[PDB]
Design a protein around this ligand. Structure first.
Ligand code: HEA
Ligand code: HEA
Ligand SMILES: CCCCCCCCCCCCCCCC(=O)OC[C@H](COP(=O)([O-])OCC[N+](C)(C)C)OC(=O)CCCCCCCCCCCCCCC
Ligand SMILES: CCCCCCCCCCCCCCCC(=O)OC[C@H](COP(=O)(O)OCCN)OC(=O)CCCCCCCCCCCCCCC
Ligand SMILES: CCCCCCCCCCCCCCCC(=O)OC[C@H](COP(=O)(O)OCCN)OC(=O)CCCCCCCCCCCCCCC
Ligand SMILES: CCCCCCCCCCCCCCCC(=O)OC[C@H](COP(=O)(O)OCCN)OC(=O)CCCCCCCCCCCCCCC
Ligand SMILES: CCCCCCCCCCCCCCCC(=O)OC[C@H](COP(=O)(O)OCCN)OC(=O)CCCCCCCCCCCCCCC
Ligand SMILES: CCCCCCCCCCCCCCCC(=O)OC[C@H](COP(=O)(O)OCCN)OC(=O)CCCCCCCCCCCCCCC
Ligand SMILES: CCCCCCCCCCCCCCCC(=O)OC[C@H](COP(=O)(O)OCCN)OC(=O)CCCCCCCCCCCCCCC
Ligand SMILES: [Ca+2]
Ligand SMILES: [Cu+2]
Ligand SMILES: [Zn+2]
Lengths: 67, 59, 102, 120, 51, 113, 534, 269
């Protein structure tokens, strides 16, 4: 009644934002060093190998997902 | 020796709890609480050595 | 119920005639509009006279609100309003749209 | 000072349901050594009188406010489930007459008055 | 036994008339439950030399 | 003081389901006496001429297996048959006693070498 | 105070002790799942410094706590012990000291499970504690023994309560209630208690066999000695599929109550719902080897088991079509139990359709021990049984507590858990169909993309759980004021369209069960004189 | 009887049990038993005194619970007809649960025997295992169980028939025959070639018949308490339900011993 749909829309978006922010703040407490394979150069050098071995022909083989 | 009416007249006309209403209940109930009180807390004393990893002396 | 439509109208005419207070006329009206049919004009007329006997005016307005919600069109509603007009003006009940105009 | 309540009309509380013992060389039958609620039920079944009402609800007619369906109760209220003037004609509507309010069904519309037969 | 009726007498814990705030009891009841796996994690990491 | 406290709570006492209750009360007695008679008849005509024929069968085997253990007490453990792979599983030692001995370990018939 | 709660003998007190333990252990299992899902957020060691044993121990604790210490003592232990005597008109359960020991053996299972975690390394074996990993060679120490004793004490509780339930609804029904005129929740607890009684023996036999294998040098599942671990798989899963139908059948009963009272029309074909529940319970004993499709059975074995696993889609389909038919043509009052029931009706069917994808042993070679299976069962568990559990709480809490909850906060909590659970468990099908295996603390780097979004959704789910904790606090403190102001729904049924606001006031509650006619918080002696029914 | 006096009773036939300490006492005893055996199995406790104390506390707490049940049923008159029907139904569900435990154990035996391993030699009973022959002592054990049922049947029907000496003597004969069976099983277990560690054969064999042995020692205990309560006039001619549960228990232990006999001693040799 009279603007409680708006309240339980704002509360849902606020809960999503608080969850994203606290997820970020406890991702800041993880291991400081990601594995060596999670950069762009390693993944291009793995797609090198996969192209040489004809991997995943009709789908895709490319492994690059990081920067 | 057919004491059942005489015991009905005690168990129904009583104020005490049901496990206390017999005359011989102080002979069962007072040792049992001591035996129970050591039986439930002595493994709880060995819980920290089991966490630390200290085995008992056997040799 | 393997009821025909005519058995429905003859059941609910004599069901509205035997209601004796405001609980009963509202109850019978509820469980006659809780079917998959708009009631015939005759049983709506019997419902109006029954709400007249118990002397409650907003139930005779809620009858027309209910059949507005119950019919498929607005021309079925206007067909009900055509030949239910005489009994409505005789009892003197207003429709809700002309009572609370938006 | 009390005795043993041969029939149901001599039951006066629970100190009257005791029993005489068996003699010494006989297995007891239950008129000898039963007490309490079990002896009350045994006495009732010996008289044919079934204590502990388990009769279902009167659904022979439709209660009006002029003649309700009178429900006997040993307290101030009773939960009653209406299902119609035949046995089952609608989804059960559970109701609760108290001593000061009748209960009207709202699906069939039968009316239940309560009379309190107990003591408060 | 005849027991008390009412609104707050059906729960084993005290809510209304307390010398301590109720949120103490309420949130410390659940923070212990949320904190059992962290005690588990701490002792099984101290046993494995990670701390 | 309620007005309606002294009226009867049940009404008419039924007279045929009390008689039928009492006749079953006194008829399971007579049938239980006859049932007990025929069951002691069965328990002494059949059950004790069964123990009487199996006790004389088991005295013989209690002789000729105790005497087999008697001559097995003179066979030392290098003359014992070597245990198969599945025999005498020792995952961890038993937490009682001396290790390898189990709960009913008769050392004559059981040997772990 | 010690006799009411320690020496307890009334079912309505043991029910709230069950509920307190259930929500405590659910906080424990949700914390364990948060640690699991936080470690799984990115490749490499993140929070547990390597130490995959601790990961496996946390997975064991998460599964065992959430199944045997939240859903069973919540649904069966709380709701059955509370509501089945009140809905059959019983004064109490038959055998009430049994009903008290069936609660008090659960904190003891909890403390032995927690010290199973604290001793040498914990039992990291999965919740299906398979030998030879669960043996004494691969798991040295008292960890697995204490986990087995936790399962023993929980099985003692759920067997004694099952006997209690069967006898108290076959014997203590009130004086108009034939078996055909039972509520659907009573039929749920009834059929669940038979499944418990028929299935918990074989589990107790199998894990006692495992315990004797570990400690008493006997060889049931030791290969060097004549055993077979496939015998453990058979003896476990003959309990294990009846266990998961035990988890869901009271949820079906709760949904059939909620949907009918918030559609304001009765359930479409009630006796066919009873027949469908009984057929699910009967057929659940014939399907146990669909968890064993890979172990090396015959082809005709697997053909029968695909057939029998497939033909349980018929009574569940009858139930779900009946739920859609009993909301069709209704007057839907969108309250929080109704929101949870509609979310059940969507997400449970999605989990069941992935279940019939898994039912084909031809196809289950592509999906076994993958995260696809994890997606199926976490759908039908944390969106079937947890959603019906939340529906039961929001449906019965103000009646049986006397205190209303904040309605807007409840709907915020619903939408947050409905978003968050979807975000956790929907990408698990993508991971499982691409080949990601189960029970791994670390994965190849190509699985990072959906694992990150799943652990983002994990925080939404636990944020809604924290909101639920605050909703409990606001209900316990301000629950008498929520009736006065407009922060709560006081009547779960509105007036009918021609029913006056004053004619509604003499018939405020219109229910087909006794639970909403009682006094709020119900009396210590409900039903002094027995209730009566035509 | 009048309304005023009918109002001083319960209005429904069911036992509203008084609050009792033995649920939480047996629960803590099971806790102490679990925590004691899981630490003496792995050497963190020196001797078996903690396990002995825990089993003793468990047994005495169960005895005090049963003493209170006897007190309620005999000295307070709380067991009406509906309560009797409920107790009989609960005991029937209990014996169905135990028959299902035995069905799991028979499944274990059959899964080991229907097609055995290669490490035993595609053989049943395995090579080197000297199986127990079904003719000598287990035949006497079937005979003294089929006869124990015949004794307890006339003891029951003579308890109904008014006889006292013919029921007490039949109960005494039943109890002594049960302890004859238990001592004969002890003699077989001592003079058996294989042990419980001798492979999967000894595992499944001693599991099945040792669970039956434990059920028979509890059967001897409840036959003893039935003799005590019949001599001390607790049991009556129409209201003897613990006796009836013991009769049901004898007659299901008889048929599961027969299944153990024909499976473990005839088909499996
Ligand atoms: C009861 C069933 C249940 C529930 C609810 C959950 C809930 C969750 N589970 Fe899991 N899970 C299992 C049962 C369950 N799980 C099982 C059986 C396994 C197998 C273990 C094995 O492989 O051996 C498993 C394993 C498992 C895996 C696979 C990991 C692996 O294979 O090793 C993952 C993946 O991240 C996971 C995560 C989660 C997450 C993030 C939640 C989140 O959904 C948590 C969010 C849920 C809530 C917030 C619920 C509300 C909380 C309450 C306490 C309800 C209270 C309400 C009332 C009391 C009225 N759990
Ligand atoms: C809440 C408990 C629950 C429920 C209700 C179910 C329901 C079903 N489950 Fe599931 N399942 C589990 C809990 C549950 N499951 C658990 C815990 C595991 C993993 C255990 C472990 O490994 O640790 C598991 C894993 C599991 C496996 C093992 C796969 C593997 O481990 O490799 C299989 C195999 O067939 C299976 C299938 C099914 C099927 C066919 C249903 C059906 O009952 C679903 C029926 C519902 C529908 C079919 C949808 C509705 C119907 C219609 C809309 C009608 C029209 C549809 C059709 C005609 C198809 N699930
Ligand atoms: C409010 C609190 C203030 C903001 C807190 C967040 C601060 C922040 O910048 O977070 C960074 C994270 C990156 O998190 P990460 O990629 O896991 O790296 C964390 C650091 N390591 C583990 C390498 C040591 O970045 C992220 O968390 C990205 C995830 C964000 C989730 C929502 C994205 C969509 C929003 C709409
Ligand atoms: C990212 C944000 C996601 C949304 C979060 C905010 C939502 C707030 C909504 C709100 O608050 O709406 C409140 C409205 C009621 O409005 P009213 O008509 O009573 O208005 C009266 C004047 N104010 O209930 C609705 O939504 C109607 C729909 C509710 C359906 C809920 C079902 C639960 C989900 C089941 C899954 C779907 C299955 C079917 C899919 C095919
Ligand atoms: C952990 C739980 C996460 C929080 C989710 C539930 C809380 C809902 C609060 C809400 O929904 O706040 C939405 C309301 C909508 O304002 P209104 O129209 O009700 O204003 C009427 C006066 N209250 O903002 C507020 O009132 C207060 C402002 C809240 C914002 C605080 C954080 C700022 C960023
Ligand atoms: C498995 C544990 C054994 C369960 C026996 C159930 C019998 C059914 C029955 O008839 O139970 C009746 C009684 C309980 O009666 P009560 O006091 O609840 O009833 C009150 C009416 N007089 O059983 C028992 O004393 C069970 C005692 C179990 C002791 C713990 C063992 C744990 C292992
Ligand atoms: C930081 C965390 C999020 C803060 C939310 C701010 C709300 C803004 C506000 O102040 O909102 C004002 C409203 C007014 O309330 P109303 O609905 O009565 O009025 C409605 C007016 N139309 O309060 C709320 O509805 C939200 C209150 C809920 C807050 C959640 C509390 C934290 C929950 C997690 C912690 C507890 C569990 C942890 C233990 C394990
Ligand atoms: C609880 C519900 C689940 C029950 C699951 C099955 C329970 C099995 C009962 C075990 C009895 C085994 C037995 O009595 O075996 C007897 C054996 C000893 O005999 P032996 O091999 O030394 O004699 C042969 C010498 N010639 O004792 C044991 O070493 C194990 C004792 C602990 C068992 C617990
Ligand atoms: C462990 C040892 C188990 C020995 C059990 C002896 C039970 C004595 C109590 C008794 O016999 O209780 C007597 C009552 C009824 O008494 P009644 O009506 O016959 O009295 C007649 C007065 N006129 O029977 C019961 O409630 C059922 C007993 C079931 C007990 C099952 C326990 C199983 C435990 C498994 C673990
Ligand atoms: Ca990782
Ligand atoms: Cu399954
Ligand atoms: Zn009606």
């Amino acid at each position: 009644g009279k603007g409680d749909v708006a309240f339980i829309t704002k509360g849902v978006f606020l809960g999503l934002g608080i969850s994203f922010g606290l997820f970020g703040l406890v991702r800041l407490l993880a291991n400081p060093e990601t594995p060596k394979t999670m950069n762009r150069e390693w993944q291009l050098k793995s797609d090198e190998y996969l192209k040489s071995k004809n991997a995943n022909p009709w789908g895709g083989y490319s492994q690059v997902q990081s920067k | 020796a057919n004491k059942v009416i005489q015991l009905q007249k005690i168990f129904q006309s009583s104020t005490k709890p049901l496990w206390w209403r017999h005359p011989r209940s102080a002979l069962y109930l007072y040792p049992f609480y001591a035996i129970f009180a050591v039986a439930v807390v002595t493994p709880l004393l060995y819980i920290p050595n089991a966490i630390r990893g200290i085995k008992a002396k056997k040799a | 119920d393997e009821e025909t439509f005519e058995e429905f109208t003859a059941r609910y005419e004599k069901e509205f005639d035997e209601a004796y207070d405001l609980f009963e006329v509202q109850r019978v009206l509820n469980n006659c509009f809780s079917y998959d049919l708009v009631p015939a004009p005759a049983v709506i007329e019997k419902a109006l006279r029954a709400a007249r006997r118990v002397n409650d005016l907003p139930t005779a307005i809620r009858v027309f609100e209910a059949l507005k919600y119950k019919v498929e069109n607005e021309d079925q509603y206007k067909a009900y309003l055509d030949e239910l007009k005489d009994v409505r003006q005789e009892l003197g009940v207003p429709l809700k749209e002309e009572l609370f105009p938006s | 000072v009390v005795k043993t309540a041969q029939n149901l009309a001599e039951v006066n509380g629970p100190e009257t349901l005791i029993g005489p013992g068996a003699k010494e060389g006989t297995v007891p039958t239950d008129l000898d050594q039963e007490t309490g609620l079990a002896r009350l039920e045994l006495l009732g079944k010996l008289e044919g009188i079934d204590v502990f009402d388990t009769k279902p609800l009167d659904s022979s007619r439709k209660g009006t406010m002029k003649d309700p369906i009178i429900i006997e109760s040993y307290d101030d209220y009773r939960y009653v489930g209406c299902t119609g003037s035949p046995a089952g004609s609608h989804t059960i509507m559970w109701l609760k007459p108290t001593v000061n309010e009748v209960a009207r069904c709202w699906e069939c519309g039968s009316v239940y008055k309560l009379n309190p037969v107990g003591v408060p | 036994v005849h027991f008390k009726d009412g609104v707050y007498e059906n729960i084993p814990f005290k809510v209304k008339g307390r010398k301590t705030p109720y949120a103490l009891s309420h949130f410390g009841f659940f923070a212990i439950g949320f904190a059992v796996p962290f005690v588990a994690c701490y002792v099984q990491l101290k046993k494995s030399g990670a701390f | 003081l309620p007005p309606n406290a002294l009226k009867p709570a049940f009404g008419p006492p039924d007279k045929v389901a009390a008689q039928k209750f009492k006749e079953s009360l006194m008829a399971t007695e007579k049938h239980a006496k006859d049932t007990s008679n025929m069951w002691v008849k069965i328990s002494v005509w059949v059950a004790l001429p069964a123990i009487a024929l199996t006790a004389v069968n088991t005295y013989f085997v209690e002789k000729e297996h105790a005497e087999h253990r008697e001559h097995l007490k003179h066979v030392p453990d290098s003359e014992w048959p070597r245990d198969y792979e599945f025999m005498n599983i020792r995952s961890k030692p038993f937490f009682w006693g001396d290790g390898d001995k189990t709960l009913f370990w008769n050392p004559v018939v059981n040997r772990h070498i | 105070m010690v006799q009411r709660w320690l020496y307890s003998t009334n079912a309505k007190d043991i029910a709230v002790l069950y509920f307190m333990l259930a929500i405590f252990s659910g906080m424990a299992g949700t914390a364990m799942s948060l640690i699991i899902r936080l470690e799984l957020a990115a490749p490499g060691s993140q929070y547990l410094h390597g130490n995959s044993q601790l990961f496996n121990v946390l997975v064991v604790g998460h599964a065992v706590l959430m199944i045997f210490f939240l859903v069973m003592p919540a649904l069966i232990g709380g709701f059955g012990n509370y509501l089945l005597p009140l809905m059959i008109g019983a004064t109490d359960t038959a055998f009430p000291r049994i009903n008290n020991i069936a609660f008090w053996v659960l904190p003891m299972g909890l403390v032995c499970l927690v010290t199973s975690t604290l001793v040498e390394s914990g039992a990291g074996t999965g919740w299906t504690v398979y030998p030879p990993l669960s043996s004494i060679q691969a798991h040295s120490g008292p960890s697995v023994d204490l986990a087995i004793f936790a399962l023993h004490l929980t099985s003692i509780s759920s067997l004694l309560g099952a006997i209690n339930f069967i006898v108290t609804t076959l014997n203590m029904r009130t004086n108009g209630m034939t078996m055909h005129k039972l509520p659907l929740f009573v039929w749920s607890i009834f059929i669940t208690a038979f499944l418990l009684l028929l299935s918990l023996p074989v589990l107790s036999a199998g894990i006692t066999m495992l315990l004797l294998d570990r400690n008493f040098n006997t060889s049931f599942f030791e290969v060097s000695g004549g055993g077979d671990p496939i015998l453990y798989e058979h003896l476990f899963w003959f309990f294990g599929h009846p266990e998961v139908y035990i988890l869901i059948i009271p949820g079906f009963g709760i949904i059939s109550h909620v949907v009918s009272t918030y559609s304001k029309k009765p359930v479409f074909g009630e006796i066919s719902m009873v027949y469908a529940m009984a057929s699910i319970g009967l057929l659940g004993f014939l399907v146990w080897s669909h968890h064993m499709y890979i172990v090396g059975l015959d082809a005709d074995t697997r053909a029968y088991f695909t057939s029998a696993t497939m033909i349980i889609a018929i009574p569940t389909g009858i139930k779900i079509f009946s739920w859609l038919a009993t909301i069709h043509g209704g007057s839907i009052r969108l309250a929080t139990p109704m929101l949870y029931a509609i979310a059940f009706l969507f997400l449970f069917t999605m989990g069941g359709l992935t279940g019939v994808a898994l039912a084909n042993a031809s196809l289950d070679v592509a999906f076994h021990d993958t995260y696809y299976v994890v997606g199926h069962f976490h759908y039908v568990l944390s969106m079937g049984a947890i959603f019906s559990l939340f529906a039961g709480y929001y449906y019965w809490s103000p009646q049986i507590l006397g205190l209303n909850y904040n309605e807007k906060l409840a709907q915020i909590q619903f939408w947050l858990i409905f978003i968050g659970a979807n975000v956790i468990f929907f990408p698990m099908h993508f991971l499982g169909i691409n080949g990601m295996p189960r029970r791994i603390p670390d994965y190849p780097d190509a699985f990072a993309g959906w694992n990150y979004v799943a652990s983002i959704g994990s925080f939404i789910a636990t944020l809604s759980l924290f909101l639920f904790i605050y909703i409990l606090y606001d209900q316990l403190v301000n629950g008498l004021n929520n009736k006065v102001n407009n922060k709560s729904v006081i009547y779960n049924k509105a007036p009918d369209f021609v029913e006056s606001n004053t004619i509604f006031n003499l018939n405020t509650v219109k229910s087909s069960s006794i639970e909403f006619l009682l006094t709020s918080p119900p009396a210590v002696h409900s039903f002094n004189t027995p209730a009566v029914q035509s | 009887m009048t309304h005023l006096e009918r109002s001083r009773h319960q209005q429904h036939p069911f036992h509203m049990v008084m609050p009792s300490p033995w649920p939480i006492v047996v629960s803590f005893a099971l806790l102490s038993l679990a925590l004691s055996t899981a630490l003496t199995m792995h050497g963190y406790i020196g001797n078996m005194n903690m396990v002995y104390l825990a089993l003793f506390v468990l047994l005495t707490s169960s005895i005090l619970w049963f003493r209170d049940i006897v007190a309620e049923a005999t000295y307070l008159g709380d067991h009406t007809m509906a309560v009797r029907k409920g107790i009989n139904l609960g005991f029937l569900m209990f014996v169905l649960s135990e028959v299902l435990i035995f069905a799991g154990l028979f499944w274990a035996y059959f899964h080991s025997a229907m097609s055995p391993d290669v490490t035993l030699g595609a053989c049943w009973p395995p090579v080197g295992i000297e199986a127990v022959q079904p003719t000598e002592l287990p035949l006497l054990n079937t005979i003294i169980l089929l006869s124990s049922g015949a004794t307890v049947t006339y003891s029951h029907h003579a308890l109904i028939a008014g006889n006292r000496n013919k029921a007490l003597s039949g109960l005494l004969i039943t109890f002594w025959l049960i302890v004859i069976f238990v001592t004969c099983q002890y003699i077989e277990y001592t003079n058996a070639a294989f042990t419980i560690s001798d492979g999967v054969y000894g595992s499944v064999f001693y599991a099945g018949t040792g669970l039956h042995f434990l059920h028979m020692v509890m059967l001897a205990a409840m036959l003893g308490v039935n003799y005590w309560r019949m001599r001390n006039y607790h049991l009556t001619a129409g209201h003897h339900v613990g006796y009836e549960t013991t009769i049901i228990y004898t007659h299901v232990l008889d048929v599961i011993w027969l299944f153990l006999y024909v499976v473990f001693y005839w088909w499996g040799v």
